[PDB]
Symmetry: C3
């Protein structure tokens, strides 16, 4: 491997993706990444907080992008200020529980894992210390995604090359914040203190919150995603613990790999697709109309009550051939 090129990557926070090339500009390389585990309380919504544990300080953890055949070398750091052991499980990797069996680090320790990205597709990576700690760390926010692109870029159902202009990584996460009898949420001093109460909520399998980018409304309003008519946007969607059903209200999924593995034929013209808990999928869409769109988990209760809604603001010219208000809302009243 000493004869292989090495590339150091600088991760960017979700929903954005670090600089990369869709078509590998060279042969296999060793991709170097680094992440610092950060334990901190985060505001999921008004009067709703989570004693979170995160990869690099964000929920979801940052998106890593490499090419099939490349190697991935991740330096994982657990700062001394943290309270618990952590590790990492790459669904894109082969062996040792995705790397989990070789990356258990206590506060104050670091580890470097190398694995060969032998299979193309978007994959989930997440913490999994062992036993009950596995689901707890994940629902506390410790999960992200790594996208392994085919060396010759994405291909459609006919083998034709497809390209995107922008990648938006939508990391959906389900959380189980304990509630008082009146429905209000509980707050704790640290992750450990709220464990017992959180387990009770987890056992009901009913999330208190289901969010994109770690908080209700994170990608709405001023945080709304941007695009222009004509843009081919690849929406990579991950859900490490629970199913989701992504939909771009106002648009469609032109090409969709709901199971997220690129060598499989993608489906076309979907209104809503399905992301299995414990996986990442991808949908490509070319914007044809300007305006506001709503990217959601299409169980509308989960989208609106739980928080699984993002907004996309698209600039450009309107096309009346596709849609037109023939008769505007009108009528007498009293």
């Amino acid at each position: 491997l000493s004869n292989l090129p090495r590339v150091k990557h600088t991760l960017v926070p979700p929903p954005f993706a670090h600089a990369h090339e869709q078509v590998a500009a060279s042969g296999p390389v060793i991709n170097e990444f680094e992440m610092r585990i950060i334990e901190k309380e985060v505001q999921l919504d008004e009067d709703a907080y989570l004693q979170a544990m995160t990869f690099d300080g964000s929920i979801p953890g940052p998106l890593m992008i490499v090419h099939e055949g490349d190697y991935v070398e991740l330096t994982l750091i657990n700062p001394p200020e943290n309270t618990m052991p952590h590790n990492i499980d790459f669904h894109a990797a082969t062996g040792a529980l995705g790397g989990g069996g070789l990356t258990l680090i206590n506060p104050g320790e670091k580890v470097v894992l190398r694995f060969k990205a032998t299979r193309a597709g978007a994959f989930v990576y997440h913490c999994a210390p062992g036993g009950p700690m596995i689901p707890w760390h994940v629902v506390s926010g410790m999960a992200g995604c790594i996208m392994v692109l085919p060396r010759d870029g994405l291909k459609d159902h006919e083998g034709k090359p497809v390209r995107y202009d922008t990648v938006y990584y939508i990391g959906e996460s389900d959380h189980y914040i304990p509630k008082d009898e009146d429905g209000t949420y509980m707050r704790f001093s640290d992750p450990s203190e709220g464990y017992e109460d959180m387990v009770a909520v987890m056992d009901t399998l009913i999330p208190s919150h289901i969010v994109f980018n770690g908080a209700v409304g994170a990608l709405t309003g001023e945080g709304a995603l941007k695009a222009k008519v004509g843009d081919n946007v690849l929406f990579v969607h991950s859900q490490p613990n629970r199913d989701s059903r992504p939909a771009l209200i106002g648009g469609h999924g032109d090409l969709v790999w709901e199971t997220g593995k690129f060598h499989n034929a993608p489906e076309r013209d979907l209104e809503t697709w399905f992301i299995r808990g414990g996986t990442a999928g991808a949908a490509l869409y070319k914007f044809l109309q300007p305006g506001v769109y709503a990217y959601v988990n299409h169980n509308l209760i989960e989208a609106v009550h739980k928080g699984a809604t993002a907004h996309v603001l698209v600039e450009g010219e309107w096309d009346n051939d596709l849609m037109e208000q023939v008769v505007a809302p009108v009528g007498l009243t009293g």
Copy 2:
């Protein structure tokens, strides 16, 4: 832009400059920079403190160096420990108030701005959140410089190539620390607390301190700059809010671009030049004599009472043809 090379730069603290090449060793590239905003109290002088806000923990912010035609991608980070929103305005950029309208980040947020460095010259970059916050953040220390070199290096008034051996970035900053009736300076717990009192001083337009590298005497004594006879030193001087009149006591400005834009003809043999508030200029000088030099803002009150003085210690052999003490101080007394 995916076909353009990417170069990751590691910034060094002022008055020094990160490694670079005067003549572009290749075609246009995308220059990647990262800075962390740091809010902290700094000692401007004995018994004089400033609740500062800085780019990367220094005043001035670090110097960025790229070439005309290149792109600049800056990752700006506002850590959660900070108290206020911040952003960045690049005078070298075109649009959105220099980037200010696209980089407003609250504590705990990050942003990445890309702009094309279409014009050669030294430019100021500074924070400008909006309204009254603009001058306040700047005089609190949030300003630096980015130098955009012509792809074929610097040229003189005749178009002849000129080269420097060393670059010293002198960031001059004016501060307005509140005073008690006896002239002593006030101290506060954080930036916000001292705002009202600082505004009163700002309104007088009289700085309490005018310093190089963020403190009185920062570049004097043990912090004195070093050089050798024969060295061609480029003194890049910035002042984001108030005029300055740089002068190298003991020397001159061999070639000077006081308005700081390299495609303009530089002036020669200056004794003192002028840096307009809100700009950066550059002066090149070849040392001919060893000894101590004083680089100052030539309003001597501002240089000595306010703090605008730096020292340069030059090693080498003395040249009697240029200057000689014919008769040493002598005389009877009583």
Copy 3:
């Protein structure tokens, strides 16, 4: 030097080594390294603590690897939270006390030193502020190693090329923790407070602890080093202040440069070698048998009572030709 390639390195914690090539893949380059000085109390053993001062948060400081003829540019950072001045002395460098006279930085300061690695070999680098501070900072943990490989890789006593599969940097450090009359160890709030008491122990020249990787048992048990039969492992051993006598129990030193300078002929088949205090040496060994090995300072009291013991777990097939239990422990008793 502007015409020389620049390579940015990411250091990894000891006993591991950052990615590198044994044979220089190109002509001379400028190697860029960065380290943050961290002052923190560390647990040397059960009920034994050290108010440590470290390079990059580890003891020993991380291993730097470059090639003879290259230049080394180290950015040293002394964060504002630290309490004392620090600097760095590279035994691999020429002039200014190894760089110590040009790198004295107070808390809140940074410095960048460049030196030419003109001589091949493993060298110690350590803090040396001046006077009594020199030994104190070193025995507080401020020492590491830089390995300068010949451009054409390592060579044996006959000039034949030798290669290793893995490098393990064993940084041995002697500490002098004050003891109560009953033998128990004292604890302090910061380095300065325990200085006077530590000096008394230092004067006896008897270390309370002698450890690998900064703590008793750091590289034993779960921290045991790993290897496979057939692996050529290079054990680089440093001791900045006191002599050590490394030995690989169960194996040997196939090729050993105990004085650590690669152009000198290495010795073969050693059972134990010698590392002079203030130096780094290197020993290469090819594992022939699977099982547990003990890498130790062969003054067994220092190895077992003081802490100088590391374990190596080797996987592979056993070779009865080399060793076999002909008659297992047997006999009548009562």
